């Protein structure tokens, strides 16, 4: 059922959250987890994606699922983004890109005559036993949160 195998150490990585606490993926054992990676706090597309998930939070709750957004911005940046937008789910400050590399979302592009790395907008659904059962890569924001919710409902049944 897994579409991606993560290094075992990934599940014990301490993930710094908005609000000043930490979590780990293993700490989410027992419920579904949506992990959405986005390139940058407080941009038009990334704000749209976060607000879309936030608007659907009660529907994710009805499945007992939790959501985590992830970028490499600082905790302070995440706190400001969460406060301004009213997000009711946490953002991971993956400043060292450890979680991003585990999910293989750091992608290289030949541009400006160089090799340029960056976060590719991507989302994953993690089962209550920690298996990555669905992945979306190179995500277009429009319709995405709705599609993730629909897939979660399909898997959780
Ligand atoms: Na950290
Ligand atoms: Na989980």
From Swiss-Prot:
<dbReference type="InterPro" id="IPR036249">
    <property type="entry name" value="Thioredoxin-like_sf"/>
</dbReference>
<keyword id="KW-0049">Antioxidant</keyword>
<dbReference type="GO" id="GO:0008379">
    <property type="term" value="F:thioredoxin peroxidase activity"/>
</dbReference>
<dbReference type="GO" id="GO:0005737">
    <property type="term" value="C:cytoplasm"/>
</dbReference>
<dbReference type="InterPro" id="IPR013766">
    <property type="entry name" value="Thioredoxin_domain"/>
</dbReference>
<dbReference type="GO" id="GO:0045454">
    <property type="term" value="P:cell redox homeostasis"/>
</dbReference>
<keyword id="KW-0575">Peroxidase</keyword>
<comment type="similarity">
    <text>Belongs to the peroxiredoxin family. BCP/PrxQ subfamily.</text>
</comment>
<keyword id="KW-0560">Oxidoreductase</keyword>
<feature type="disulfide bond" description="Redox-active">
    <location>
        <begin position="46"/>
        <end position="82"/>
    </location>
</feature>
<comment type="subunit">
    <text>Monomer.</text>
</comment>
<dbReference type="Pfam" id="PF00578">
    <property type="entry name" value="AhpC-TSA"/>
</dbReference>
<feature type="active site" description="Cysteine sulfenic acid (-SOH) intermediate">
    <location>
        <position position="46"/>
    </location>
</feature>
<comment type="function">
    <text>Thiol-specific peroxidase that catalyzes the reduction of hydrogen peroxide and organic hydroperoxides to water and alcohols, respectively. Plays a role in cell protection against oxidative stress by detoxifying peroxides and as sensor of hydrogen peroxide-mediated signaling events.</text>
</comment>
<protein>
    <recommendedName>
        <fullName>Peroxiredoxin Bcp</fullName>
        <ecNumber>1.11.1.24</ecNumber>
    </recommendedName>
</protein>
<dbReference type="InterPro" id="IPR000866">
    <property type="entry name" value="AhpC/TSA"/>
</dbReference>
<dbReference type="InterPro" id="IPR050924">
    <property type="entry name" value="Peroxiredoxin_BCP/PrxQ"/>
</dbReference>
<keyword id="KW-0676">Redox-active center</keyword>
<keyword id="KW-1015">Disulfide bond</keyword>
<dbReference type="GO" id="GO:0034599">
    <property type="term" value="P:cellular response to oxidative stress"/>
</dbReference>
<feature type="domain" description="Thioredoxin">
    <location>
        <begin position="2"/>
        <end position="157"/>
    </location>
</feature>
């Amino acid at each position: 059922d897994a579409v991606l195998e993560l290094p075992a150490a990934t599940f014990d990585l301490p993930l710094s959250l908005s609000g000043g606490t930490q979590t780990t993926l293993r700490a989410h054992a027992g419920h579904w987890l949506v992990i959405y990676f986005y390139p940058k706090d407080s941009t038009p597309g990334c704000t749209t994606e976060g607000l879309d998930f936030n608007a659907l939070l009660p529907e994710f709750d009805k499945a007992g699922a939790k959501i985590l957004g992830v970028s490499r911005d600082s905790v302070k940046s995440h706190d400001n983004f969460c406060a301004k937008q009213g997000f009711a789910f946490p953002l991971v400050s993956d400043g060292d890109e450890a979680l991003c590399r585990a999910f293989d979302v750091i992608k290289e592009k030949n541009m400006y005559g160089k090799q340029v790395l960056g976060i590719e907008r991507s989302t994953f659904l993690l089962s209550p036993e920690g298996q990555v059962v669905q992945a979306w890569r190179k995500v277009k924001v429009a319709g995405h949160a709705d599609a993730v919710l629909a897939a979660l409902k399909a898997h959780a049944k």
